[PDB]
Amino acid sequence: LLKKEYTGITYISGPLLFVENAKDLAYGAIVDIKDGTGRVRGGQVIEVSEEYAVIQVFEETTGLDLATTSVSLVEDVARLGVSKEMLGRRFNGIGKPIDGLPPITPEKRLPITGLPLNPVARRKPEQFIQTGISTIDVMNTLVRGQKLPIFSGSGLPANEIAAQIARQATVRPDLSGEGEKEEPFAVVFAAMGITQRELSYFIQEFERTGALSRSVLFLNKADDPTIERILTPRMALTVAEYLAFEHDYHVLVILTDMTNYCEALREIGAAREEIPGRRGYPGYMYTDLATIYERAGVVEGKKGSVTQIPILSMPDDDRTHPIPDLTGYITEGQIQLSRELHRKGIYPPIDPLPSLSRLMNNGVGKGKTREDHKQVSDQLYSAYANGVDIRKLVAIIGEDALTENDRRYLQFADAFERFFINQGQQNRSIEESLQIAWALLSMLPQGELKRISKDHIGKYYGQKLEEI
Amino acid sequence: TEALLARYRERAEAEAKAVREKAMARLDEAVALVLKEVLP
Amino acid sequence: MIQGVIQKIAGPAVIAKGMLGARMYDICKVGEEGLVGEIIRLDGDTAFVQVYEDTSGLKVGEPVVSTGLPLAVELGPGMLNGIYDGIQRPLERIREKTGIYITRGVVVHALDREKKWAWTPMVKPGDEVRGGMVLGTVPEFGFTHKILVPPDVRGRVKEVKPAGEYTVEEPVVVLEDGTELKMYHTWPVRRARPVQRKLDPNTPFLTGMRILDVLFPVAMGGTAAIPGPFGAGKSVTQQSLAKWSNADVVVYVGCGERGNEMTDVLVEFPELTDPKTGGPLMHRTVLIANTSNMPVAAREASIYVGVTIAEYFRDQGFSVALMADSTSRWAEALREISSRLEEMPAEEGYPPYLAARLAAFYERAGKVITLGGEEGAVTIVGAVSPPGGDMSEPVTQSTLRIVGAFWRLDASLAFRRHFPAINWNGSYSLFTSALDPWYRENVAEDYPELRDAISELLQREAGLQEIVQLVGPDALQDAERLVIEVGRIIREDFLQQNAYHEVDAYCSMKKAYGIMKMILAFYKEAEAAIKRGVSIDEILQLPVLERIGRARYVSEEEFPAYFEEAMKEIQGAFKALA
Amino acid sequence: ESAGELLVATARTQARGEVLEEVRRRVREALEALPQKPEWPEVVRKLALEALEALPGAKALVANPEDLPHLEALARERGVELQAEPALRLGVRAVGAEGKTQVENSLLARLDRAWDALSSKVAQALW
């Protein structure tokens, strides 16, 4: 309960300072750095030795000095106090309220880094989330427990898609067979380097839909300290796991602009002169991102769940950039927006071909959705790939030279983009999306549907595009 | 309409007063617990 | 034992002072919690330790104890049907002890010590025993686990315990020098286990995938690398290798990859059936799991542990398949530790000895004569995760100098939902010539000629595609158009395979040969018809094409009848056009 | 809709916070009233003992001149100097030999560092 203070500051440079006699500072401990003016700023121990301890200051080192600066221990392990009463609050990215309300009374203090989930303790994500968006529901299905990012661009509407998914996300027990009444999603929202325009959009949307009472918001703004950007997703996921696996909640985590997280990580790595990787990003960026992304899933013997929908803006629309590249190696698929579709006026502008969901098969078919889902999706993929290839051919050798089958594939590609992908702000149940899908597939000769068994073609083929 | 908001405002005032009144019945005991823990 | 204290903590690395006499690559317990680590540098009175566990909360001045022994695995009955951490700790036991999260510092034996095994001696008093001989046997799950002599142990038998039920600790044979031989022995994971002789691979590592089994095979003791960008199908391909391969035992190493994949294996396999044995698939599988968010340095330990266990089961006389979920993450771990050591990097930050480590790992594969005189084999398939799909990276380039097959995944094919998504233009195999004798007597006498014809058709299609994409299909002659169409038929009806389909997931060699023969027969008849003035459209609109297009979804037990019928129908249809 | 429920919840939270602030004030006055209550020598001696246990290499102790008449016997017994300083009341601090480490055991600081841990128990007691 007592306070230990170290005054042997020997060196300050960039975001680091060296403390001389700090043998009792554990590796990874949190400290308070008090300035001559009495202002206190935080920091974490990143290396310790008999000679000195290297501290990483979360905010700029302006105003510190070697004569009147003192470092005090705060906790051996970076922890966060969590309570069910977190729902409906706002926090600043280090965990402190910015809602003008009294601080929470913690039921428990949890280490923010968390602990790895035992693989034998997990269970398979199998419950299908209905997002109301056909391009996701039919072709890139999301299931509870999944980690499915949105690969966005600079000026593209990824925030709109995230808000729409949060609004329309439902689980449809009627198809599954349990028949029990659903429960709503809690939303944990972590913002890193977010601008006021985007924050205003999100706050207004959540207020409009009433979800701001069943949500927790951690807001690191683009005017907030950069090194604090590394704590935000970890605190968000600590709260998410607490709620899900101790109170049986179904949480939906949105991490907006993970590109900002990776930029902060590069800043720190460059400061510490660690061995870089591909474009100056630290060689351990993959492990660091995994420690955030692999905190989703579903546990055996637990009713709750954690779904993650990270949002990252691909630099220069480049998919081979280290940030998207490493994310795609960790996450379970990705939803990639198309600048071309956006310029054509399509919302949501989700490109199917560079989009994938890896957990779709464990969430669709018999006893979940309806039996033709997987084959319909496969056939749509084949047809759209052929349509895009024929479109490439047409841009060289003109439309008039096309065979009639190729002309059909062209018409399919266009109708797809204009009726399946484009749906505005509408909420489509899985039944309506599958109906539209079969309507588009009916544009092709019944014999070219090689991915679908005969029975399904008989059952559903032949509906026109008269849907209204 | 505004009637629901007025009713909820009355409910909020009632709840706040009720929480305060419930608290007043044990304040000294909580002070004693905090003193026992904080003192050595 | 050498005891010292922590002098410095930096990530997965700890420097311990007072360790004069500690040896290179020995195991030391770091901290009050006894975290496992390996010494990798000695300097004066200090030792650099890489820790195979999380280091948060450690304080300077905490004890460091050297065990005197290198990193070793327990090798004995109890490993089949199990899932292990990187340093061989049963994860079921870890869960039962620490709940749903992996807490650090848990000490538990790799092999259960309270289990009873039915022991059948195969030796008698007075018998001379050399390294690797079979002392006896114990049933495990339908396998016949042979209790071996450790490789570096010689002597004469003094007493043999009679048939009965014993734990792994019971001395089942005692030698004259007094050395007690149990059901298990420890082996260092960085020393390759010895063999009598290395053989020439002459039989195929059947996989269940048509493309890999036909165009780019791997021999039973060969090595393959399967690199690919994210989303291409590495995990699905390796899981299918594990489910359908003709190996006796599969050691599946999840080095720094998704934990849902480990859960998927654990949940699904217990319900599938071993293709040959008939029992549950899990019963032939060893799982080594060091997921992405588990400690970084344990990735290397996981690789070595898996390869040593594979060598052990080879030494019992089994054909073993080793899958490495990503060697790229092993390379990343080495890069991290070299960053802590303050070493100077080679290309892209990796240490210059990366190629040496990869080479040593892959050279443990091979068909061999065991020290016991029986034939064993270990087959290694290695997954590489190049950043951006670039194949000019150090890990892929270092692997390509040592593997005998190069299964190249392509993101363009995966975007079009063409799976397994193997670039047949960029892939190769150095085992095709050596496996021809086996094919000519186990598949068909002319199988290699059909395979060569299909490869030639694909090469012609690749040549024509560049012309078509710029000048349109109509500009070609009828022969080239037929080649384009047959190349498409090969792609969609032969090269594509659905891992999630109840029948198409697995394909036998006979079925692949049948599909190829049907395709080539159709091509010959179509060429004849083109010369006879038949229109390409007439050929394409034929109904036999549907028969060939649905042939892969037909089951094995009825495929030959379908095949005979379709072969008749091909001639019947091309006679109809006249 | 739930706007009224938001009003109710914010009122409840503000009330709970004000109640806890009242409890905090009661505790802090109770602490600052110690230098009068005849135990205030024994408590400062116990705090000094704890501080000395905190620093193995302790070389000095610091306390207000009023606390000195009680801490002198412990200071001399423990082989550590004593100094009169108008520093924080309600405790003692130990100074390391090199002069770069220091442990303080004020009761106000202990209250600050224990409030978060005690809040759960206090809330369960009150309600």
Side-chain angles (χ1 to χ4, degrees):
Chain A
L1 282 185
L2 57 80
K3 188 172 181 180
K4 173 93 156 269
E5 288 250 358
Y6 310 87
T7 61
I9 318 307
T10 64
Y11 168 92
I12 302 166
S13 184
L16 310 178
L17 63 81
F18 295 3
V19 192
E20 188 165 353
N21 281 92
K23 289 193 322 303
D24 288 345
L25 292 185
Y27 173 77
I30 301 291
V31 289
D32 284 344
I33 317 172
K34 193 163 47 55
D35 191 1
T37 63
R39 193 197 153 197
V40 175
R41 61 193 95 177
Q44 180 165 36
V45 178
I46 53 148
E47 294 180 350
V48 65
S49 67
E50 287 197 323
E51 291 48 38
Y52 48 70
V54 181
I55 282 154
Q56 190 178 238
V57 189
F58 291 140
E59 54 200 25
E60 42 71 26
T61 56
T62 312
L64 295 184
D65 67 0
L66 301 180
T68 60
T69 303
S70 68
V71 174
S72 42
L73 181 68
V74 184
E75 33 182 21
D76 199 39
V77 157
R79 282 180 208 275
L80 172 91
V82 291
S83 163
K84 179 183 175 180
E85 293 179 350
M86 294 192 112
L87 300 169
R89 303 294 306 274
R90 294 179 188 172
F91 304 112
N92 78 334
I94 169 166
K96 307 327 285 147
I98 58 161
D99 195 4
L101 269 153
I104 294 158
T105 300
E107 282 156 322
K108 179 192 318 291
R109 310 185 33 79
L110 292 168
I112 63 184
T113 57
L115 273 155
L117 265 175
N118 201 325
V120 311
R122 289 195 191 248
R123 72 183 156 88
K124 286 175 71 24
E126 95 191 348
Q127 197 73 21
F128 149 63
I129 289 167
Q130 176 174 279
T131 62
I133 303 170
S134 308
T135 56
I136 293 172
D137 273 1
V138 174
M139 309 210 280
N140 311 94
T141 320
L142 188 92
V143 303
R144 265 190 191 141
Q146 184 170 11
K147 48 178 178 169
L148 194 49
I150 288 160
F151 278 14
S152 187
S154 54
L156 294 184
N159 294 332
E160 289 67 339
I161 292 163
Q164 184 168 352
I165 282 167
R167 181 200 318 140
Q168 309 178 325
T170 180
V171 178
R172 291 298 303 274
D174 287 345
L175 315 173
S176 179
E178 51 258 20
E180 186 57 286
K181 188 173 179 180
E182 178 171 40
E183 293 177 350
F185 274 97
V187 167
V188 178
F189 176 82
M192 288 148 288
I194 197 168
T195 73
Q196 249 299 296
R197 201 215 334 119
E198 295 176 349
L199 189 59
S200 311
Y201 174 81
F202 275 118
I203 295 295
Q204 291 179 336
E205 275 288 285
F206 296 154
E207 289 175 350
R208 190 174 63 74
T209 61
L212 216 51
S213 65
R214 52 177 165 83
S215 79
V216 190
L217 272 72
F218 295 92
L219 305 175
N220 178 262
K221 295 183 204 74
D223 276 340
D224 290 345
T226 299
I227 297 166
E228 292 186 9
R229 219 161 287 175
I230 289 170
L231 300 150
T232 320
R234 281 172 178 81
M235 284 165 183
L237 285 164
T238 302
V239 173
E241 286 158 280
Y242 176 69
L243 290 173
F245 307 123
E246 309 219 41
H247 296 318
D248 312 302
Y249 273 93
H250 297 289
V251 176
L252 172 58
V253 188
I254 295 167
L255 316 171
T256 60
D257 291 345
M258 290 289 299
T259 292
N260 288 118
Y261 180 89
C262 295
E263 296 267 38
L265 206 71
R266 179 162 69 171
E267 209 199 12
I268 289 179
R272 305 184 33 196
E273 270 160 32
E274 308 161 314
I275 290 177
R278 176 55 53 124
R279 276 180 214 200
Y281 287 95
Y284 58 86
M285 182 157 91
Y286 175 89
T287 310
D288 199 310
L289 292 171
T291 45
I292 287 163
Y293 291 142
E294 282 181 351
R295 303 181 76 178
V298 291
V299 179
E300 184 178 2
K302 305 287 200 144
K303 294 179 179 179
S305 56
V306 187
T307 51
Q308 291 191 41
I309 288 168
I311 299 159
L312 63 97
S313 82
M314 297 199 287
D316 201 4
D317 276 29
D318 181 17
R319 191 180 145 114
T320 58
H321 187 279
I323 288 161
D325 194 50
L326 297 185
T327 298
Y329 276 119
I330 298 156
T331 58
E332 294 160 30
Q334 68 281 338
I335 306 299
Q336 193 163 305
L337 313 183
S338 204
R339 200 164 285 280
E340 280 57 24
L341 291 172
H342 189 233
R343 296 286 294 291
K344 292 177 182 179
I346 305 288
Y347 182 99
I350 290 162
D351 213 323
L353 295 185
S355 318
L356 178 58
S357 163
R358 303 164 104 268
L359 291 207
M360 172 169 68
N361 288 332
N362 204 53
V364 310
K366 311 297 211 304
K368 288 192 292 187
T369 323
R370 95 196 174 195
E371 57 263 25
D372 57 335
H373 190 146
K374 192 188 172 292
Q375 293 179 341
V376 164
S377 168
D378 272 327
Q379 191 52 50
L380 277 173
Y381 274 117
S382 304
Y384 188 62
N386 287 334
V388 174
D389 314 338
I390 287 158
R391 214 142 60 167
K392 277 183 290 194
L393 197 92
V394 165
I396 313 304
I397 67 161
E399 290 176 350
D400 289 345
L402 290 208
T403 60
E404 189 174 1
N405 190 38
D406 305 330
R407 221 173 275 97
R408 266 188 228 115
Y409 276 105
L410 256 201
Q411 309 151 353
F412 171 80
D414 176 38
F416 188 91
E417 273 147 58
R418 267 200 326 128
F419 293 104
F420 200 67
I421 305 183
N422 202 12
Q423 56 170 86
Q425 294 289 167
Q426 291 179 336
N427 191 347
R428 289 182 177 166
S429 71
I430 191 66
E431 288 103 350
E432 333 193 16
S433 291
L434 282 164
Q435 192 192 38
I436 300 161
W438 269 114
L440 283 161
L441 280 171
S442 40
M443 297 176 70
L444 306 178
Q446 151 172 306
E448 295 299 318
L449 308 186
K450 264 177 242 204
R451 301 297 193 81
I452 312 185
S453 83
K454 306 290 143 151
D455 291 345
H456 295 352
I457 301 205
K459 259 160 42 158
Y460 298 105
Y461 182 94
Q463 170 151 6
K464 202 59 65 164
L465 282 294
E466 61 178 32
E467 179 268 315
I468 46 164
Chain B
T1 50
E2 189 60 32
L4 300 177
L5 292 176
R7 180 178 180 276
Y8 275 115
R9 280 192 296 274
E10 294 292 327
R11 174 58 172 182
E13 289 179 20
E15 182 79 325
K17 278 182 163 65
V19 166
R20 208 278 301 285
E21 292 298 307
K22 287 177 176 180
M24 293 300 290
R26 295 283 188 288
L27 184 130
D28 61 336
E29 304 196 339
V31 171
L33 174 61
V34 176
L35 273 200
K36 286 299 298 293
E37 286 292 337
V38 76
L39 276 153
Chain C
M1 300 171 76
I2 303 300
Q3 319 215 359
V5 289
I6 297 180
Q7 186 178 2
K8 189 190 203 282
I9 307 152
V14 161
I15 302 184
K17 80 180 183 149
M19 304 268 312
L20 195 65
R23 299 148 62 201
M24 287 276 100
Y25 290 97
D26 259 1
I27 289 277
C28 82
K29 291 164 280 232
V30 181
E32 292 288 355
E33 324 178 69
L35 316 179
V36 181
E38 192 160 36
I39 294 161
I40 50 166
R41 180 177 69 82
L42 281 156
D43 194 323
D45 185 61
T46 74
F48 194 100
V49 182
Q50 72 177 15
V51 192
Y52 299 133
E53 292 177 351
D54 195 32
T55 47
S56 276
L58 288 175
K59 279 176 202 225
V60 168
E62 279 187 37
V64 190
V65 187
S66 180
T67 68
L69 305 169
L71 174 54
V73 289
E74 285 149 294
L75 294 174
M79 275 173 321
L80 290 178
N81 196 34
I83 173 156
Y84 286 103
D85 194 359
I87 63 160
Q88 220 203 9
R89 286 182 295 183
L91 279 170
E92 286 280 352
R93 301 289 143 86
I94 277 146
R95 177 177 64 87
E96 290 180 350
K97 276 185 76 170
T98 60
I100 66 169
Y101 296 112
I102 301 170
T103 315
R104 71 183 176 203
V106 295
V107 165
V108 51
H109 313 281
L111 315 181
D112 198 305
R113 297 299 210 268
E114 292 176 350
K115 195 169 181 295
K116 301 270 178 320
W117 305 87
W119 154 259
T120 300
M122 288 185 31
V123 295
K124 298 192 287 289
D127 268 340
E128 294 176 350
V129 291
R130 294 180 183 175
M133 294 194 346
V134 178
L135 301 175
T137 311
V138 298
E140 202 151 17
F141 285 122
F143 299 88
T144 299
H145 202 112
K146 326 215 205 146
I147 309 308
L148 300 180
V149 181
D152 291 345
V153 172
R154 285 180 67 168
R156 195 148 62 145
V157 176
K158 191 178 59 48
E159 87 194 51
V160 178
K161 295 215 83 64
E165 299 265 84
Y166 302 109
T167 65
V168 295
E169 293 285 302
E170 292 298 335
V172 290
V173 168
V174 191
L175 304 188
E176 289 179 350
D177 62 355
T179 57
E180 280 167 342
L181 299 187
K182 315 170 148 220
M183 293 191 183
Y184 76 101
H185 65 268
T186 56
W187 189 255
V189 301
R190 316 176 96 100
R191 275 226 289 147
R193 293 173 58 84
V195 291
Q196 260 188 27
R197 177 162 54 109
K198 293 180 180 179
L199 305 173
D200 302 275
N202 65 85
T203 71
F205 171 59
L206 289 174
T207 279
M209 257 150 280
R210 273 184 297 277
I211 191 154
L212 306 180
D213 289 338
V214 177
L215 297 187
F216 317 108
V218 170
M220 195 77 248
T223 50
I226 171 157
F230 75 86
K234 279 188 305 315
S235 65
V236 182
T237 304
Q238 285 183 330
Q239 276 211 51
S240 52
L241 297 176
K243 294 159 79 129
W244 302 109
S245 57
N246 75 334
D248 295 310
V249 181
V250 174
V251 177
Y252 181 72
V253 179
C255 170
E257 294 299 318
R258 263 158 285 214
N260 280 330
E261 293 179 350
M262 295 294 118
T263 314
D264 215 20
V265 174
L266 287 171
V267 186
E268 282 187 350
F269 279 31
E271 297 94 311
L272 312 173
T273 59
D274 188 328
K276 64 187 288 180
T277 316
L281 190 73
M282 203 48 237
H283 286 60
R284 76 159 195 184
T285 316
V286 178
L287 296 173
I288 291 98
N290 192 79
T291 58
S292 201
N293 62 343
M294 288 174 74
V296 70
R299 296 182 191 169
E300 176 193 320
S302 82
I303 288 283
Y304 286 105
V305 166
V307 82
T308 305
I309 287 169
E311 282 179 319
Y312 179 63
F313 279 102
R314 165 203 81 188
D315 294 345
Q316 279 162 72
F318 292 122
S319 64
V320 187
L322 182 68
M323 326 281 175
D325 213 30
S326 200
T327 70
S328 300
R329 313 309 169 203
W330 171 26
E332 188 208 329
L334 293 174
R335 177 165 71 189
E336 168 74 16
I337 289 297
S338 61
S339 192
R340 300 298 182 176
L341 287 165
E342 309 287 6
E343 277 171 340
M344 296 304 302
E347 290 170 308
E348 304 183 354
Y350 296 112
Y353 51 76
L354 175 65
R357 306 286 176 89
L358 286 166
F361 166 66
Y362 276 108
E363 195 89 71
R364 301 224 216 168
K367 198 198 186 356
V368 309
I369 299 286
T370 64
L371 300 171
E374 294 303 320
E375 297 173 350
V378 172
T379 303
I380 302 176
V381 185
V384 200
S385 65
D390 206 356
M391 300 282 160
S392 301
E393 313 305 307
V395 184
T396 293
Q397 280 305 141
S398 313
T399 305
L400 287 177
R401 299 208 291 262
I402 298 169
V403 294
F406 174 40
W407 298 338
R408 194 198 174 124
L409 290 166
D410 199 60
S412 67
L413 295 165
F415 282 11
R416 294 190 178 177
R417 272 59 186 183
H418 176 114
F419 300 117
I422 296 290
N423 184 350
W424 56 94
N425 294 300
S427 295
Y428 63 75
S429 158
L430 309 175
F431 300 99
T432 313
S433 64
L435 290 178
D436 279 345
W438 185 96
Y439 292 138
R440 284 187 197 286
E441 39 172 20
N442 295 284
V443 185
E445 293 177 350
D446 55 343
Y447 160 92
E449 277 47 33
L450 261 68
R451 184 197 62 209
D452 290 27
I454 286 282
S455 312
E456 290 175 350
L457 270 168
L458 287 169
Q459 262 178 36
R460 296 248 295 292
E461 188 189 7
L464 287 168
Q465 281 285 1
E466 299 187 329
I467 296 150
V468 172
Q469 72 190 359
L470 296 173
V471 183
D474 281 349
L476 310 196
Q477 300 300 342
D478 287 345
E480 312 319 318
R481 293 175 65 187
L482 177 63
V483 167
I484 293 288
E485 303 328 323
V486 162
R488 179 212 105 221
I489 283 156
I490 285 165
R491 289 175 186 173
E492 301 193 27
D493 301 346
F494 181 69
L495 294 187
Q496 270 170 207
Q497 191 165 358
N498 193 352
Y500 303 109
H501 194 261
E502 292 179 350
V503 169
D504 199 32
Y506 165 78
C507 191
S508 65
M509 291 298 298
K510 297 313 221 321
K511 187 175 169 175
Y513 170 84
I515 297 168
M516 297 166 79
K517 191 178 179 189
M518 299 168 31
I519 290 158
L520 274 163
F522 178 90
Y523 172 79
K524 297 294 181 185
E525 291 324 313
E527 183 179 1
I530 288 164
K531 263 208 209 61
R532 288 139 74 66
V534 161
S535 177
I536 299 291
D537 305 346
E538 292 171 293
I539 296 169
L540 194 138
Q541 298 324 124
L542 291 174
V544 61
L545 273 193
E546 171 70 305
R547 209 82 62 201
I548 305 204
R550 307 270 177 160
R552 51 173 170 128
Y553 306 109
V554 181
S555 51
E556 311 275 329
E557 69 280 354
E558 67 187 41
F559 177 84
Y562 186 99
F563 167 78
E564 290 181 350
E565 173 269 317
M567 292 289 284
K568 270 126 177 156
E569 183 177 2
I570 288 162
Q571 293 179 334
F574 273 105
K575 173 61 162 66
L577 291 184
Chain D
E1 292 177 350
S2 60
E5 298 196 357
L6 294 178
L7 302 180
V8 173
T10 190
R12 188 190 296 138
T13 47
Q14 283 276 5
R16 288 180 75 107
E18 292 293 312
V19 169
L20 287 204
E21 285 258 334
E22 292 176 350
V23 174
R24 267 272 289 272
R25 275 154 63 230
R26 291 304 87 74
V27 171
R28 75 97 158 147
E29 290 100 48
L31 296 194
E32 80 190 320
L34 291 172
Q36 312 292 342
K37 297 202 292 184
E39 302 91 343
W40 61 273
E42 190 65 13
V43 315
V44 307
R45 281 163 173 167
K46 251 64 180 175
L47 296 168
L49 154 63
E50 231 180 71
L52 280 169
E53 195 279 338
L55 292 177
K59 183 169 183 281
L61 298 170
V62 152
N64 300 78
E66 288 72 3
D67 290 345
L68 259 62
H70 326 307
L71 296 164
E72 280 158 28
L74 275 67
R76 296 299 183 185
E77 177 164 35
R78 293 288 299 216
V80 290
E81 310 170 32
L82 50 90
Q83 274 85 8
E85 187 81 348
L88 299 176
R89 306 292 298 110
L90 299 174
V92 195
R93 72 171 58 159
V95 178
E98 71 294 341
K100 297 301 193 285
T101 62
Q102 173 183 327
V103 173
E104 163 55 61
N105 216 359
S106 175
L107 293 172
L108 292 175
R110 291 155 81 69
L111 174 50
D112 288 344
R113 306 178 71 276
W115 177 248
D116 57 359
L118 300 175
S119 197
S120 70
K121 305 180 180 286
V122 171
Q124 287 193 352
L126 295 206
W127 306 284

